[PDB]
Ligand binder design. Sequence first.
Ligand code: ZN
Length: 199
Amino acid sequence: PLSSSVPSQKTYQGSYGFRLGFLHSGTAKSVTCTYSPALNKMFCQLAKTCPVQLWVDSTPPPGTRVRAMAIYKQSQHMTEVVRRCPHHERCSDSDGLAPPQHLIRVEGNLRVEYLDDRNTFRHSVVVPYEPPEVGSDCTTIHYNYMCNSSCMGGMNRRPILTIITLEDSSGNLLGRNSFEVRVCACPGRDRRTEEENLR
Ligand SMILES: [Zn+2]
């Protein structure tokens, strides 16, 4: 439906120095997920792994959680809840955990939680924060987008952002960053073209 609210998209690094990182994968036609620093935009395939890295200068307490949420980028669509198209809503798609209409899933984590906000109508997915490996600099979450940017009845060629928030056990904001996302068939190919846009 239509949300009444619009989520905040402002970058906020906060106490813990919270930032996002991405694999630098290139644009070889074979790559399924590649990020463009120029456009601050992730190019990913339908249902393929999209790794997103959490980087903190300071370790947040335990019980901290990581939420991901999609919104439309253009002003005239902001109040519209990003949601899978009817075809992929009805698809034999289920991973056993995720609601059939959420765009964003997390793979590899039985502690995942999915939320239909009963006041705003917004979809989000939440996982526990885990500190990096001893000897790693970052935490990695594997995200899946289950509906193409092309799908009419869904996003229908309108751009989206993903909003990653850091929250504490009670849900208070600890930090926030964001990136654009396009779910296509040719991520390597469509990034180099869009990076060719710009110049
Ligand atoms: Zn779809």
